[PDB]
């Protein structure tokens, strides 16, 4: 249901653009989010865009540096990553779920998203 | 006090637990659909298992020995102190295992590691499950059907409230947490009711160790271990026989009947541990035991038969109300299954006697008898009649088993081996 594109070996400080495409039909009703998992740690929240007012949420490590956006015309979502530091090296995955799965304050929990992508590697030299 | 009055209290508490479960289950279905249900399947079965595992399965022994020493303050304090130590020690060990292996446990439950935080929370929630079940088992040792029932009622109602807040706040994972909190929140009213009703002094619950009583309570842990294998194994390779010659649809027909029949059995015999187990624990003379067993059978067999006949008459309504309408041929299975349930309830009367006497040896023999009988009948009837044969095998199994229970009781009561 989700496929990822972009990423790779990037020099520290350079920009990077990830994109995620979704199949199906009903897409504007799914909350969209980015998660990442570094070698040795667990899945951590990165960014999330809502299904309604287009609201955004960012982990404190990527706020101001990372920007998530969505386009309901092509059913894709994007993540712009500027000022990449070595701590950003991880496998990045997009996730989709219904707003009833996130609740009021559970939008950051990866277990609230049953639909996942394969993950794209991002390595910041 | 009597088995009838205890059934009246226990029926009210069990009905509230059923109504609360149906409410929470439909809230979970509407909120998260089949994807949420499929991801919650293993986690929910773990919550069921923890109801006995969290306190090392000593609960029936707690009830048995509290009843035996309910007029012996010195021994009663030792019983409750050792039971508290065993529940505290095991639940603490369980909490450490859960928090340390939250990633492998999450993988086995959900298929990935994204639920480590929920598992670590459950490590603390299962402490409330173990401690709540201990307090309930204490009340049952005193035959306090009202305290037990009122505690469970308050816990169910606050559980529904907690589930609502939990899933509204934290979405799907909050909903799962609420599912774990359903049996844990009973500890709050149970502790209040036990102290307020004057059953025992609060100080009895301070952990102490008595080697004798610990070894005696361990016998009930070993019965819990045996029970979690034998007949579950039996139904697993019963499903094997079913799938070997029939479709998964027929397998679902049988699994639906069995699971709803087991819930029916748990509701009907819930007062056995509240009244029958403590009463038979106090009685030691064979004349007194026979009188109580006979009186119990004279009450429970006509009551369960009348109730089960009503259910069979309304089997179409019971299917439409309690189960998803994805299978409606199980109606032919109701009659056979319900007959087996009546005789199984009768066989429970003898089974709780074995519990009341802490006879590990008779417990093993009762369990092996049920397993082998189930296997002889299933291997015969399932390959020829599918899910209907599985229901027939279940019924035939407990026809023979109840008769065997009567015969073995007669040999024991008449002291055939002396
Ligand atoms: C012999 C049986 C004993 C039963 C004992 C309990 C009695 C109390 C009843 C409690 C309520 C059960 C859950 C209600 C949810 C209904 C949702 C209805 O759903 C709807 O409206 C939509 O269609 C959902 O898709
Ligand atoms: C699944 C078996 C796991 C055994 C784990 C053994 C751990 C080492 C500790 C042993 C003391 C165990 C007491 C028995 C718990 C059995 C739960 C039995 O639960 C049940 O019967 C539920 O109602 C299942 O629905
Ligand atoms: C020692 C092994 C022999 C086992 C024989 C069966 C004894 C039955 C009672 C066992 C008490 C331990 C579990 C406590 C969980 C009850 C949750 C609350 O649920 C209830 O009470 C409902 O009424 C269930 O339907
Ligand atoms: C000290 C006070 C008096 C107690 C003296 C004896 C203590 C141990 C005896 C317990 C009584 C069990 C009686 C058998 C009932 C049938 C169920 C047993 O299940 C069966 O029927 C099996 O198939 C047996 O093989
Ligand atoms: C039960 C053995 C047969 C397996 C059937 C699978 C259906 C779902 C699992 C358990 C049924 C328990 C009642 C369902 C409503 C949940 C009550 C509130 O939830 C809970 O707190 C329970 O602990 C959930 O298990
Ligand atoms: C407290 C006694 C009640 C008697 C009637 C019970 C009917 C099920
Ligand atoms: C029969 C009682 C059903 C559950 C009621 C829950 C109240 C919060
Ligand atoms: C110090 C008490 C530990 C209890 C472990 C479990 C016994 C069955
Ligand atoms: C979460 C509470 C578990 C039980 C604690 C019991 C303390 C005596
Ligand atoms: C878990 C052990 C509690 C303290 C036991 C004391 C025995 C005299
Ligand atoms: Cl004993
Ligand atoms: Cl003995
Ligand atoms: Zn003994």
XYZ file of C-alpha atoms and ligand atoms in Angstrom:
711
model
C 0.000 0.000 0.000
C 3.018 2.282 0.485
C 6.202 2.620 -1.578
C 9.167 4.890 -0.851
C 11.565 6.791 -3.095
C 14.615 8.969 -2.568
C 17.462 8.815 -0.094
C 20.973 7.428 -0.137
C 24.459 8.514 0.885
C 24.470 12.293 1.385
C 27.202 14.618 2.631
C 26.593 16.157 6.055
C 24.881 19.522 5.639
C 23.298 18.754 2.272
C 19.580 18.595 1.585
C 17.543 15.493 0.763
C 14.000 14.857 -0.434
C 12.016 11.718 0.382
C 8.679 10.852 -1.212
C 6.115 8.131 -0.529
C 3.360 6.959 -2.871
C 0.157 5.256 -1.749
C -2.235 2.963 -3.604
C -5.914 2.349 -2.862
C -8.672 4.941 -3.143
C -9.532 6.775 0.079
C -6.319 8.700 0.774
C -7.384 12.130 2.069
C -8.815 10.415 5.181
C -5.532 8.735 6.190
C -3.143 10.510 8.530
C 0.352 10.377 7.039
C 3.602 10.189 8.972
C 7.333 9.583 8.675
C 9.227 7.308 11.048
C 12.895 6.356 11.167
C 14.868 3.485 12.695
C 18.631 3.730 13.193
C 20.875 0.637 13.475
C 20.699 -0.367 17.139
C 17.573 1.572 18.186
C 13.813 1.291 17.662
C 11.380 3.122 15.394
C 11.191 6.797 16.384
C 8.726 9.435 15.228
C 9.942 11.993 12.687
C 7.017 13.926 11.210
C 3.272 13.624 10.690
C 0.713 15.399 8.507
C -2.990 15.127 9.260
C -5.886 14.120 7.015
C -8.031 17.210 7.630
C -6.679 20.724 8.234
C -3.212 19.763 6.964
C -1.704 20.155 10.433
C 1.876 19.012 10.974
C 3.836 17.560 13.887
C 7.600 17.164 14.183
C 9.993 15.486 16.570
C 12.155 18.016 18.384
C 15.226 16.699 16.537
C 13.900 17.641 13.086
C 11.760 20.705 13.825
C 12.901 23.620 11.685
C 15.153 21.268 9.715
C 12.593 18.795 8.321
C 9.309 19.647 6.602
C 6.556 17.155 5.741
C 3.932 17.885 3.087
C 1.232 15.995 1.215
C -0.536 16.162 -2.150
C -3.951 14.493 -2.247
C -4.058 14.883 -6.045
C -1.408 12.195 -6.632
C -1.739 10.529 -3.190
C 1.887 11.223 -2.280
C 3.638 12.703 0.753
C 7.088 14.280 0.978
C 9.811 14.953 3.546
C 12.354 17.719 2.931
C 15.460 17.218 5.094
C 17.889 20.142 5.424
C 20.971 20.499 7.641
C 21.540 16.748 7.827
C 23.719 15.699 10.774
C 25.169 12.197 11.319
C 22.436 11.497 13.892
C 19.876 11.420 11.059
C 21.294 8.218 9.532
C 18.469 5.663 9.641
C 15.957 3.756 7.543
C 13.023 6.087 6.888
C 9.500 4.696 6.520
C 6.171 6.308 5.695
C 3.057 5.148 7.537
C -0.697 5.476 7.028
C -3.595 5.023 9.446
C -7.077 6.323 10.244
C -7.540 9.146 12.791
C -9.305 6.760 15.192
C -6.018 4.843 15.492
C -4.075 7.925 16.644
C -6.562 9.422 19.084
C -5.841 12.779 20.678
C -2.191 12.377 21.748
C -1.151 9.088 20.171
C -0.067 10.474 16.810
C 3.598 9.808 17.635
C 3.275 6.087 18.414
C 4.368 3.844 15.500
C 2.089 1.048 16.745
C -0.884 3.252 15.831
C -0.048 2.863 12.112
C -0.810 -0.603 10.657
C 0.219 0.308 7.086
C 3.922 0.730 6.355
C 6.353 1.138 3.489
C 9.445 -0.902 2.728
C 11.787 1.809 4.029
C 14.505 3.791 2.257
C 18.045 4.143 3.574
C 19.456 7.566 4.455
C 23.162 7.712 5.336
C 24.627 11.065 6.397
C 28.414 10.911 6.009
C -24.912 -19.408 52.890
C -25.606 -21.825 50.033
C -24.708 -22.647 46.446
C -27.985 -21.108 45.249
C -27.455 -17.726 46.929
C -23.843 -17.684 45.728
C -25.106 -18.316 42.193
C -27.446 -15.323 42.525
C -24.596 -12.977 43.462
C -22.173 -14.473 40.938
C -24.685 -14.355 38.069
C -25.118 -10.603 38.545
C -21.364 -9.963 38.448
C -20.792 -12.299 35.488
C -23.621 -10.692 33.504
C -22.097 -7.240 34.023
C -18.711 -8.571 32.898
C -20.359 -10.013 29.783
C -22.285 -6.817 29.062
C -19.141 -4.747 29.577
C -17.137 -7.059 27.322
C -19.728 -6.896 24.550
C -19.725 -3.101 24.829
C -15.932 -2.808 24.742
C -15.606 -5.415 21.991
C -18.042 -3.629 19.693
C -16.372 -0.284 20.434
C -13.047 -1.835 19.413
C -14.520 -3.361 16.244
C -16.174 -0.134 15.055
C -13.063 1.900 15.873
C -10.348 -0.286 14.338
C -12.087 -2.807 12.058
C -10.722 -6.228 11.103
C -7.150 -4.903 10.937
C -7.317 -3.796 14.568
C -8.926 -7.074 15.630
C -6.315 -9.193 13.853
C -3.484 -7.228 15.456
C -5.121 -7.463 18.903
C -5.767 -11.226 18.793
C -2.547 -12.465 20.411
C -2.369 -9.528 22.844
C -5.904 -10.284 24.058
C -5.121 -13.981 24.548
C -2.083 -12.956 26.610
C -4.353 -10.840 28.835
C -6.549 -13.897 29.415
C -3.516 -16.057 30.257
C -2.188 -13.439 32.691
C -5.374 -13.758 34.754
C -3.937 -17.024 36.090
C -0.233 -16.726 35.247
C 0.460 -13.381 36.940
C -0.126 -14.847 40.405
C 1.497 -18.212 39.612
C -1.896 -19.949 39.605
C -2.099 -20.314 43.402
C -5.518 -18.641 43.625
C -7.576 -21.813 44.117
C -5.101 -22.842 46.810
C -5.506 -19.460 48.493
C -9.265 -20.032 48.618
C -8.819 -23.638 49.768
C -6.480 -22.935 52.675
C -8.133 -19.683 53.768
C -11.377 -21.662 54.040
C -9.610 -24.448 55.942
C -8.127 -22.002 58.475
C -10.848 -19.327 58.530
C -11.268 -19.978 62.282
C -7.494 -20.158 62.916
C -6.031 -16.633 63.059
C -2.406 -17.754 63.430
C -2.481 -20.100 60.430
C -4.697 -17.724 58.434
C -2.085 -14.973 58.754
C 0.586 -17.439 57.623
C -1.544 -18.500 54.638
C -2.211 -14.940 53.460
C 1.365 -13.858 54.154
C 2.887 -16.685 52.128
C 0.340 -16.155 49.341
C 1.192 -12.445 49.269
C 4.911 -13.261 49.091
C 4.356 -15.718 46.234
C 2.205 -13.311 44.216
C 4.564 -10.393 44.874
C 7.650 -12.444 44.025
C 6.289 -13.983 40.832
C 4.574 -10.821 39.567
C 7.820 -8.912 40.122
C 9.769 -11.559 38.205
C 7.123 -11.386 35.470
C 7.406 -7.591 35.315
C 11.175 -7.860 34.840
C 10.856 -10.506 32.111
C 8.272 -8.357 30.323
C 10.296 -5.132 30.427
C 13.584 -6.843 29.518
C 12.138 -8.794 26.566
C 9.557 -6.234 25.439
C 10.914 -6.397 21.878
C 10.740 -10.211 21.395
C 7.339 -10.258 23.120
C 6.036 -7.489 20.853
C 7.348 -9.413 17.838
C 5.511 -12.573 18.887
C 2.302 -10.672 19.659
C 1.995 -8.177 16.787
C 4.616 -9.206 14.208
C 6.928 -6.224 14.744
C 8.694 -4.368 17.556
C 6.584 -1.185 17.495
C 4.698 -2.117 20.695
C 7.570 -2.258 23.201
C 6.116 0.588 25.264
C 2.741 -1.135 25.571
C 4.459 -4.354 26.675
C 6.476 -2.462 29.294
C 3.240 -0.927 30.582
C 1.622 -4.378 30.743
C 4.571 -5.433 32.924
C 3.147 -3.103 35.583
C -0.519 -3.766 34.761
C -0.146 -7.511 35.380
C 0.837 -6.706 38.973
C -2.649 -5.274 39.464
C -4.104 -8.372 37.802
C -2.206 -10.701 40.145
C -2.935 -8.666 43.277
C -6.595 -8.183 42.389
C -7.074 -11.901 41.782
C -5.420 -12.650 45.135
C -7.845 -10.394 47.022
C -10.794 -11.999 45.225
C -9.464 -15.466 46.084
C -9.238 -14.386 49.731
C -12.913 -13.383 49.722
C -13.854 -16.707 48.123
C -11.999 -18.477 50.930
C -14.456 -16.791 53.303
C -17.406 -17.619 50.986
C -18.049 -13.861 50.661
C -20.090 -14.052 47.470
C -21.294 -10.464 47.929
C -17.847 -8.923 48.366
C -16.521 -10.890 45.394
C -19.463 -9.924 43.170
C -19.516 -6.251 44.192
C -15.769 -6.001 43.560
C -16.030 -7.481 40.060
C -19.035 -5.268 39.265
C -17.250 -2.048 40.256
C -14.161 -3.179 38.353
C -16.055 -3.857 35.127
C -17.788 -0.467 35.215
C -14.607 1.489 35.966
C -12.882 -0.662 33.351
C -15.264 0.519 30.630
C -14.646 4.124 31.682
C -10.877 3.572 31.662
C -11.033 1.942 28.221
C -13.003 4.902 26.850
C -10.511 7.483 28.124
C -7.571 5.309 27.075
C -8.528 4.806 23.423
C -9.840 8.355 22.975
C -6.504 9.663 24.260
C -4.057 7.174 22.767
C -5.855 5.642 19.804
C -5.339 1.966 19.031
C -2.514 1.429 21.528
C -4.567 3.202 24.186
C -7.391 0.789 23.377
C -5.076 -2.193 23.872
C -3.912 -0.715 27.186
C -7.553 -0.394 28.230
C -8.042 -4.070 27.408
C -5.212 -4.939 29.800
C -6.634 -2.563 32.424
C -10.059 -4.274 32.421
C -8.971 -7.161 34.725
C -6.350 -5.072 36.566
C -8.604 -2.288 37.892
C -10.498 -4.828 40.031
C -7.685 -4.449 42.589
C -9.028 -1.031 43.650
C -12.544 -2.133 44.741
C -11.295 -5.539 45.918
C -8.834 -3.925 48.333
C -11.479 -1.448 49.516
C -14.176 -4.102 49.941
C -11.899 -6.546 51.781
C -10.829 -4.010 54.415
C -14.193 -2.257 54.753
C -16.123 -5.522 55.198
C -13.856 -6.625 58.058
C -12.927 -9.936 56.419
C -9.274 -9.904 57.513
C -6.892 -7.378 59.049
C -4.871 -5.429 56.503
C -1.642 -6.624 58.152
C -2.310 -10.200 56.990
C -1.222 -9.134 53.486
C 2.344 -8.299 54.557
C 4.617 -10.789 52.744
C 5.909 -13.630 54.907
C 7.266 -17.092 54.129
C 6.119 -20.460 55.470
C 7.853 -23.403 53.805
C 4.997 -25.830 54.463
C 2.219 -23.599 53.155
C 4.396 -22.556 50.203
C 4.820 -26.193 49.198
C 1.082 -26.724 49.616
C 0.150 -23.710 47.489
C 2.687 -24.942 44.922
C 0.438 -27.964 44.330
C -2.169 -25.589 42.895
C 0.457 -23.968 40.677
C 1.230 -27.432 39.298
C -2.449 -28.108 38.574
C -2.630 -24.757 36.772
C 0.395 -25.783 34.700
C -1.171 -29.146 33.811
C -4.525 -27.579 32.920
C -2.950 -25.049 30.533
C -1.605 -27.909 28.367
C -3.676 -31.102 28.306
C -7.119 -30.132 27.007
C -5.829 -27.084 25.062
C -3.525 -29.549 23.286
C -6.582 -31.757 22.794
C -8.574 -29.054 21.011
C -5.524 -28.082 18.926
C -5.199 -31.481 17.252
C -8.987 -31.727 17.197
C -8.804 -28.716 14.879
C -6.043 -30.631 13.072
C -8.419 -33.520 12.359
C -11.034 -30.989 11.219
C -8.780 -29.176 8.750
C -7.308 -32.444 7.452
C -10.606 -33.477 5.839
C -12.725 -30.297 5.770
C -12.511 -26.612 4.914
C -11.443 -23.781 7.198
C -15.095 -22.692 7.166
C -16.140 -25.866 9.000
C -13.202 -25.308 11.361
C -14.579 -21.849 12.108
C -18.039 -23.306 12.727
C -16.625 -25.599 15.424
C -14.279 -23.009 16.949
C -17.176 -20.572 17.287
C -19.308 -23.172 19.081
C -16.483 -24.215 21.409
C -15.435 -20.686 22.364
C -19.008 -19.558 23.070
C -19.720 -22.830 24.903
C -16.641 -22.325 27.085
C -17.838 -18.812 27.943
C -21.233 -20.333 28.751
C -19.530 -22.848 31.056
C -17.477 -20.151 32.804
C -20.626 -18.115 33.475
C -22.601 -21.097 34.768
C -19.956 -22.528 37.128
C -18.464 -19.216 38.301
C -20.025 -19.684 41.762
C -18.279 -23.057 42.192
C -15.032 -21.433 43.331
C -17.017 -18.908 45.387
C -19.043 -21.453 47.400
C -18.343 -25.076 46.459
C -14.544 -24.991 46.742
C -14.331 -23.344 50.214
C -17.223 -25.420 51.586
C -15.745 -28.764 50.513
C -12.350 -27.605 51.813
C -13.690 -27.347 55.370
C -15.412 -30.751 55.288
C -13.297 -33.852 55.843
C -15.762 -36.557 56.871
C -17.052 -38.668 53.996
C -20.673 -38.366 55.151
C -20.450 -34.558 55.169
C -18.727 -34.445 51.769
C -21.314 -36.764 50.203
C -24.188 -34.681 51.593
C -22.733 -31.498 50.096
C -21.905 -33.119 46.740
C -25.377 -34.674 46.473
C -27.073 -31.399 47.428
C -24.998 -29.485 44.868
C -25.733 -31.953 42.059
C -29.450 -31.915 42.896
C -29.431 -28.125 42.370
C -26.991 -27.552 39.517
C -28.066 -30.321 37.120
C -31.744 -29.241 36.817
C -30.743 -25.566 36.723
C -28.178 -25.996 33.941
C -30.473 -28.357 32.020
C -33.324 -25.838 32.124
C -30.964 -23.026 31.108
C -29.330 -25.062 28.331
C -32.703 -26.164 26.950
C -33.760 -22.510 26.780
C -30.529 -21.658 24.939
C -31.114 -24.440 22.406
C -34.656 -23.178 21.802
C -33.191 -19.725 21.082
C -30.036 -20.938 19.312
C -30.847 -18.773 16.281
C -31.232 -15.710 18.508
C -28.052 -16.574 20.421
C -26.129 -16.861 17.143
C -27.533 -13.608 15.737
C -26.780 -11.701 18.955
C -23.483 -13.085 20.260
C -21.502 -13.921 17.104
C -20.764 -12.334 13.742
C -23.173 -13.577 11.082
C -20.515 -15.282 8.967
C -21.671 -18.768 9.877
C -25.170 -19.994 10.767
C -24.923 -23.780 10.359
C -23.644 -24.220 13.905
C -27.289 -24.378 15.018
C -27.191 -28.131 14.441
C -24.157 -28.261 16.764
C -25.948 -26.567 19.680
C -27.961 -29.576 20.875
C -25.007 -31.964 21.147
C -22.725 -29.312 22.675
C -25.343 -28.191 25.212
C -25.950 -31.765 26.394
C -22.212 -32.202 26.895
C -22.157 -28.916 28.810
C -24.827 -30.111 31.259
C -22.875 -33.267 32.097
C -19.617 -31.294 32.209
C -21.141 -28.992 34.835
C -22.070 -32.105 36.800
C -18.489 -33.310 36.411
C -17.221 -29.951 37.708
C -18.808 -30.726 41.091
C -16.466 -33.694 41.491
C -13.590 -31.682 40.021
C -13.875 -28.922 42.619
C -13.885 -31.613 45.313
C -10.450 -32.682 44.050
C -9.383 -29.023 44.213
C -10.848 -28.705 47.711
C -8.794 -31.702 48.866
C -5.670 -30.429 47.031
C -5.350 -33.913 45.511
C -2.732 -33.430 42.808
C -2.955 -37.138 41.961
C -6.719 -37.160 41.355
C -6.388 -33.895 39.422
C -3.960 -35.556 37.001
C -6.254 -38.573 36.634
C -9.302 -36.380 35.996
C -7.414 -34.403 33.346
C -5.934 -37.455 31.596
C -9.372 -39.103 31.604
C -10.911 -36.098 29.843
C -8.055 -35.858 27.326
C -8.101 -39.533 26.317
C -11.901 -39.702 26.080
C -11.960 -36.548 23.949
C -9.348 -38.124 21.664
C -11.094 -41.481 21.243
C -14.377 -39.805 20.316
C -12.874 -37.069 18.115
C -10.737 -39.542 16.157
C -13.942 -41.518 15.521
C -16.582 -38.863 14.827
C -14.689 -35.882 13.360
C -13.423 -37.646 10.180
C -16.993 -38.748 9.400
C -19.148 -35.780 10.470
C -16.862 -32.737 10.587
C -17.826 -29.987 13.007
C -21.006 -31.862 13.930
C -18.835 -34.844 14.832
C -16.638 -32.582 16.954
C -19.737 -31.510 18.887
C -20.868 -35.137 19.152
C -17.400 -36.160 20.353
C -17.484 -33.436 23.017
C -20.916 -34.592 24.205
C -20.034 -38.300 24.238
C -16.783 -37.491 26.062
C -18.540 -35.917 29.039
C -21.373 -38.445 29.123
C -18.722 -41.092 29.799
C -16.646 -38.785 32.004
C -19.505 -37.837 34.341
C -20.419 -41.517 34.698
C -16.764 -42.294 35.426
C -16.720 -39.480 38.001
C -19.741 -40.990 39.764
C -18.223 -44.473 39.787
C -14.851 -43.267 41.063
C -16.599 -41.195 43.736
C -18.585 -44.244 44.844
C -15.401 -46.316 45.108
C -13.721 -43.530 47.089
C -16.712 -42.890 49.371
C -17.024 -46.599 50.130
C -13.224 -46.897 50.668
C -12.670 -49.623 48.090
C -8.881 -49.492 48.494
C -8.892 -49.909 52.294
C -28.235 -13.719 26.984
C -27.395 -12.496 26.637
C -26.953 -11.718 27.869
C -26.287 -10.394 27.522
C -25.758 -9.684 28.759
C -25.468 -8.200 28.580
C -26.685 -7.294 28.463
C -26.270 -5.826 28.324
C -25.937 -5.307 26.954
C -24.879 -4.560 26.624
C -24.525 -3.980 25.287
C -23.727 -4.844 24.310
C -22.865 -3.976 23.395
C -23.682 -2.953 22.611
C -23.050 -2.394 21.339
C -24.065 -2.195 20.214
C -23.455 -1.611 18.942
C -24.430 -1.654 17.782
O -23.710 -1.340 16.577
C -24.259 -0.516 15.702
O -25.217 0.180 15.923
C -23.528 -0.541 14.365
O -24.253 -1.257 13.411
C -22.113 -1.075 14.570
O -21.579 -1.383 13.308
C 0.203 -20.782 28.398
C 0.979 -21.541 29.468
C 2.179 -20.752 29.980
C 2.935 -21.417 31.125
C 4.061 -20.534 31.648
C 4.858 -21.158 32.787
C 5.848 -20.147 33.351
C 6.814 -20.569 34.465
C 5.909 -20.279 35.618
C 5.030 -21.149 36.125
C 3.949 -21.002 37.141
C 2.719 -21.004 36.222
C 1.305 -21.063 36.787
C 0.347 -21.393 35.644
C -0.062 -20.319 34.643
C -0.981 -20.951 33.599
C -1.936 -20.025 32.851
C -3.056 -20.814 32.206
O -3.939 -19.895 31.540
C -5.127 -20.306 31.135
O -5.567 -21.415 31.310
C -5.891 -19.192 30.426
O -7.217 -19.109 30.847
C -5.760 -19.409 28.919
O -6.895 -18.883 28.282
C -5.880 -24.462 40.122
C -6.341 -24.858 38.724
C -7.788 -25.336 38.660
C -8.689 -24.350 37.929
C -10.185 -24.570 38.125
C -10.953 -23.312 37.751
C -11.038 -22.298 38.885
C -11.762 -21.040 38.419
C -11.237 -19.798 39.065
C -9.963 -19.407 39.101
C -9.419 -18.149 39.689
C -8.172 -17.719 38.915
C -8.481 -16.697 37.831
C -9.012 -15.347 38.280
C -9.533 -14.609 37.053
C -10.998 -14.210 37.158
C -11.352 -12.942 36.388
C -12.806 -12.590 36.617
O -13.618 -13.473 35.820
C -14.662 -14.045 36.399
O -14.742 -14.264 37.580
C -15.770 -14.391 35.409
O -16.915 -14.810 36.086
C -15.273 -15.415 34.390
O -16.371 -15.829 33.617
C -8.532 -35.990 54.631
C -10.022 -35.740 54.446
C -10.681 -36.743 53.509
C -10.025 -36.809 52.134
C -9.492 -38.193 51.782
C -9.021 -38.302 50.336
C -8.269 -37.102 49.766
C -8.088 -37.306 48.259
C -9.441 -37.642 47.721
C -10.313 -36.819 47.144
C -11.686 -37.162 46.661
C -11.827 -37.341 45.154
C -12.969 -38.309 44.872
C -13.140 -38.675 43.406
C -14.211 -37.862 42.687
C -14.214 -38.151 41.191
C -13.315 -37.245 40.355
C -12.007 -37.943 40.044
O -11.913 -38.122 38.621
C -12.146 -39.333 38.141
O -13.219 -39.886 38.169
C -10.892 -39.962 37.541
O -11.205 -40.673 36.383
C -10.190 -40.821 38.591
O -9.381 -41.759 37.928
C -11.631 -16.327 25.054
C -11.160 -17.604 24.372
C -11.595 -17.705 22.914
C -10.943 -16.653 22.025
C -11.945 -15.707 21.376
C -11.290 -14.476 20.763
C -12.140 -13.223 20.912
C -11.461 -12.106 21.707
C -10.750 -12.553 22.947
C -11.294 -12.738 24.148
C -12.748 -12.613 24.477
C -13.039 -11.860 25.777
C -14.346 -11.084 25.651
C -14.377 -10.199 24.410
C -14.587 -8.718 24.700
C -13.377 -8.055 25.342
C -13.629 -7.704 26.805
C -12.547 -6.800 27.348
O -11.288 -7.361 26.943
C -10.512 -7.863 27.884
O -10.106 -7.249 28.836
C -10.189 -9.329 27.627
O -9.186 -9.771 28.491
C -9.851 -9.536 26.152
O -9.377 -10.847 25.993
C -32.578 -13.653 48.155
C -33.592 -14.730 47.794
C -34.086 -14.623 46.357
C -35.060 -15.731 45.979
C -35.521 -15.670 44.527
C -34.426 -16.024 43.527
C -34.941 -16.172 42.099
C -33.844 -16.553 41.115
C -24.954 -5.023 31.991
C -23.962 -3.873 32.106
C -23.347 -3.491 30.764
C -22.110 -2.608 30.884
C -22.383 -1.244 31.508
C -21.175 -0.317 31.466
C -21.377 0.991 32.223
C -20.199 1.945 32.078
C 10.340 -15.019 47.322
C 9.100 -15.661 46.712
C 9.262 -15.972 45.228
C 8.053 -16.675 44.623
C 8.332 -17.284 43.253
C 7.160 -18.076 42.686
C 6.808 -19.316 43.500
C 5.808 -20.221 42.793
C -0.329 -1.706 40.647
C -0.568 -2.217 42.061
C -0.246 -3.702 42.170
C -0.505 -4.304 43.545
C 0.265 -3.663 44.692
C -0.034 -4.331 46.029
C 0.691 -3.681 47.200
C 0.383 -4.360 48.527
C 9.523 -11.963 49.375
C 9.965 -12.312 50.792
C 9.206 -11.525 51.853
C 9.786 -11.668 53.254
C 9.640 -13.068 53.837
C 9.918 -13.123 55.334
C 9.865 -14.531 55.916
C 10.001 -14.548 57.433
Cl -4.000 -30.132 52.063
Cl -2.494 -35.799 50.233
Zn -4.005 -33.512 51.227
